[PDB]
């Protein structure tokens, strides 16, 4: 029952006199702007006067307890869609993690770097389900909500799973006393590359995979709260047998869901794929029938033209994460320059920001990427217009989702899911375009207020339900433990760390 | 100032070893840096102490924080008197009519041409009281971002206006005066003679004389040429000479556009980073803003005479610059040892500062190279200081925290979730932090800002003079009517 997380109506609320972006159909932006909501939707947005009108039709009871917020010093943002993130928190000891040696000098490059170790990332990912299974039921619930309120915080009102070492009804719990949006998923591998083979290797049968999301769609159809939806993925096209494809296009196309998965995402990914599987990623998951409107591949950069051409063939989505690739070693923007060329060729292209084990670049500082580096790219301040980017961290997003119903935009009809940013201090002074100053100098931590479904869940940069102290700590005892049991890691080398966390 | 010790921190050195201390200490004494380790030396150091300067020590508890040097962005432009009409508050809050113009596109090479050689005129237009309000604001924002060595590559602002600003905010500043003495005009065959080199030249010696006796240490001065399309073959010689006779340090920008090439050929005959080098101007001296569009023998004059590139890659895409991807020179001359700075570049309203700065060269040069090893969290901070300042002449002073060099460092707090389990907090500062994380800034031993606000600055008031100021400048030298810019003034979040 949804009254287990939160109690009571929103009621109207009036949000005027800041700059309202939209990232409507016309990427419509107000100056001195105002939205309207009544419970969890939106019922009117556009210049503040002609709000005010809207007010006006409310009765006495619904006006005798309007809300009025004052955003005059403030920036208005549709919530960030964030279509590809996954939930790796529990490696927070050895992925990139928090035993490194503080100087970075002796840094080598491995797994997604230097083309990527297509041997090191099969394997590592074949063995998610076994480290899923080794977590406790408590250690994912407090790994999963901490995580997911890091992305709450930084304005994320709308998460999607594409493929999480934590488990599902974990994550879909965290989402609910968040009260977040999430889209959950379940861990998808069914083949490894091993350096001592001619062929993949099945590792499980397609038929568990694909019974491990059927029992996720079961427990989440069901969900009363409109803020739990669900989406099947493929781990990597390297570890995805032909019986996987096809059981997900076929489960896809009777339960008529979205599907995602990663492919193109590295340089030394083709060869590895022909070598073990006979054909390249795009190309498999055509012969399966997954390329298609339903798709959001992540990456989808190492694309030949062939490839390139099926993906516009059948209107597919890529997600792109821009802000993350540099510190991966990933070269999925200018080695190919695939993914900007197939946005200017008229495919829908997002911004999300993958993940990793310790926070990273959040949607804003994915948005600052993409209008840096698609525009430096094509010597072309216009390609990625400030607006372009918001709408490709939100609507854009959401059409990839299959969300763009409910959420990723400002309009009447749509949930009342927004974000406040403060405008009042030096970054923003003299300048028409706050998204502009916001994408040069501010970033998730700037995020002030965020609403979902009219509900105010982070004020002043704050958790008004979350106890940001205790879901911490909660995840640093999760953490504790997992890291301890399950990855084998000395007490001696983990205790201390925790100790000294900065309380 | 006494000494001070700043312990507990995680503390970046930008040494030439670019060592890092977790727990580690600053002790400074006076305007410099004594020592800088673990904590165990520096108490040593506290211990070895004056008994009265020992007894008088302030303590600071920075266990909470990261320690880094001061910023020297080296590579910087006053450019906000343009602040209505450059990119700037005049335009409609919808971008989806922007086009592609000025360095976008390839560049206008005639446009920027013209544009640089008006910039004498409209400094002249300026009122001594506008350019002091106007620079010391623009200035003040570079100091909030952790900038305490800023160096002038060409600003359309008076030099000795900017100078007092410095003076006032207590930061350092290597002073230049414009320089343009040719234009690139569409009616013509060859450049036009737009000023006479000598008369040029006599402009950066009078600024030179002006800060000779400057007894602070935080005032020098460099000679630039604002663009090699700008820069006759006797303005490059005289600046070669001068550089030598004076012994100071030289920067321009150069190869910075795809068009740049052939519009040098049709004006000058010759391309950029070759005609520098005929004059003697490709050497150790030498600070080359952008210096991506080389080929091969310019790559090469460049690295045989020890040159020095300043890169801006927080902010090439929103002036549609190609200056990092369309060629990757400065990356594979960076590979190659040559030294390669990070820089904000300049325009009319705040911008990517150096924390933003370090960022890009961190994500867009590892992305490009496939090596998250290329650019590490702490060469970006090297680029963003110690590099830096040995381009611009002054590593005997700034640039890293070492004893003998002075005290100028920033604290930054790490005591929020973006920051948590991290052994780097430099890797989160890039990954989620910028300029307005920096929370103290010391030069010389001075606290210039804690806790993200100025100790003497007036931001509020320095704000309104530096509007005032605008307001005057956009309506009289600009000719914006007053009915465009008020209401502009009157919207502002006091
Ligand atoms: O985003 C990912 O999970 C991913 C998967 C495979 C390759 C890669 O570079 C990235
Ligand atoms: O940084 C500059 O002043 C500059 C000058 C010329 C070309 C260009 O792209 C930039
Ligand atoms: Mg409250
Ligand atoms: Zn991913
Ligand atoms: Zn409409
Ligand atoms: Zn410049
Ligand atoms: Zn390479």
């Keep these: 029952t949804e009254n287990l997380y939160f109690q009571g109506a929103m ?44 007010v006006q039709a409310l009765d006495p009871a619904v006006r005798a307890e309007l809300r ?37 000098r002796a840094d080598q490059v491995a797994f997604m770097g ?22 406790t039921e408590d250690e994912a619930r407090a790994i999963a909500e901490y995580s997911m309120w890091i992305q709450l915080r930084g304005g994320v009102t709308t998460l999607g799973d594409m493929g999480s070492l934590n488990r599902p009804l974990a994550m879909v719990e965290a989402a609910r006393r968040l009260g977040m949006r999430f889209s959950a998923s379940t861990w998808a591998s069914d083949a490894v590359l091993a350096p001592d083979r ?53 489960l896809v196309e009777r339960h008529d869901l979205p599907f995602a998965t990663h492919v193109g995402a590295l340089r030394n990914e083709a060869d590895a794929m022909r ?53 991966s070693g990933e070269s999925a923007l200018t080695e190919t320059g695939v993914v900007p060329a197939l946005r200017r060729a008229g495919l829908d292209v997002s911004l999300s920001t ?41 609507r854009i997003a959401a059409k990839g989702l299959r969300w763009d119903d409910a959420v990723g935009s400002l309009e009447p009809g749509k949930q009342a899911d927004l974000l406040l940013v403060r405008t009042d201090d030096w970054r923003y002074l003299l300048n028409p375009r706050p998204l502009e100053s916001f994408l040069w100098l501010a970033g998730s931590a700037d995020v002030d207020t965020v609403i979902v479904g009219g509900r105010t869940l982070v004020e002043g940069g ?16 999760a953490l504790r433990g997992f890291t301890t049991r399950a990855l084998r890691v000395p007490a001696e080398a983990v205790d201390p760390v925790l100790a000294e966390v900065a309380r």
């Design 462 to 477: 704050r958790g008004v339900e979350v106890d940001e102290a205790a879901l911490r700590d909660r995840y640093l005892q």
């Design 68 to 104: 009025r917020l004052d955003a005059s010093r403030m920036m208005v943002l549709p919530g960030f869609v964030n279509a590809h993130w996954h939930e790796m928190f529990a490696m927070g000891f050895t992925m990139r993690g928090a035993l490194r040696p503080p100087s970075d």
């Design 114 to 135: 230097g083309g990527g170790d297509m041997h090191q990332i099969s394997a590592t990912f074949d063995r998610f389900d076994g480290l899923i299974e080794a977590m």
């Design 275 to 327: 070598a073990y599987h006979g054909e390249t990623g795009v190309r498999r998951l055509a012969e399966a029938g997954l390329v298609d409107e339903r798709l959001m591949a992540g990456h989808s950069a190492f694309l030949d033209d062939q490839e390139q051409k099926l993906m516009l063939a059948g209107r597919a989505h890529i997600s792109h994460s821009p802000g993350k690739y540099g510190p």
């Design 354 to 394: 993958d993940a990793a084990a310790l926070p990273g670049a959040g949607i804003a500082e994915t948005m600052r990427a993409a209008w840096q580096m698609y525009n430096e790219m094509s010597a072309d301040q216009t390609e990625v217009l400030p607006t372009d980017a918001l709408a490709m961290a939100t």
């Design 198 to 250: 001619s062929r993949f290797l099945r590792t499980r049968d397609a038929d568990t995979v694909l019974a491990s999301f059927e029992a996720l769609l079961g427990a989440v159809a069901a969900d009363p709260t409109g803020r739990i939806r669900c989406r099947p993925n493929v781990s990597y096209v390297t570890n995805m047998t032909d019986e996987l494809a096809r059981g997900m296009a076929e």
């Design 11 to 54: 009621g109207a609320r009036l949000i005027t006199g800041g700059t309202v972006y939209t990232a409507d159909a016309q990427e419509s932006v107000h100056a001195r702007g105002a939205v309207l909501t009544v419970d969890d939707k939106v019922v009117a947005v556009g210049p503040a006067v002609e709000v005010e009108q809207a």
